[PDB]
């Protein structure tokens with residue numbers, strides 16, 4: 001998918017059809033840090049285990 | 056964006072997106088250098104066309 005933003009929030013959607021989704025840990029994969037990538041933006045990625053770990 | 060579109064092209068040959076983003080500066084130079092050799096290759100030898 002591709003990250004999109006309606007100007008306020010951030011979503012991940014399939015590249016061929018606007019179906020915005022919450023940016024969870026499963027929707028994405030991690031490789032590296034904030035240095036190398038040009039154009040990176042700041043936001044929060046939801047972790048599905050937070051309600052389970054807390055409860 | 057053209058930086059992002061090439062990540063689609065890279066992702067279509069079995070290479071993940073982050074390979075392009077982490078090496079975008081190297082890749083842009085490789086693309087630019089290879090294009091420049093095209094003019095020389097046609098300009099040097101006239102049997103190309």
Ligand SMILES: *[C@@H]1O[C@H](CO)[C@@H](O)[C@H](O)[C@H]1NC(C)=O
Pocket residue numbers: 038039040
């Ligand atoms: C996009 O171009 C603008 C031109 O004003 C520049 O300021 C900005 O750094 C660029 N952003 C990215 C993410 O490449």
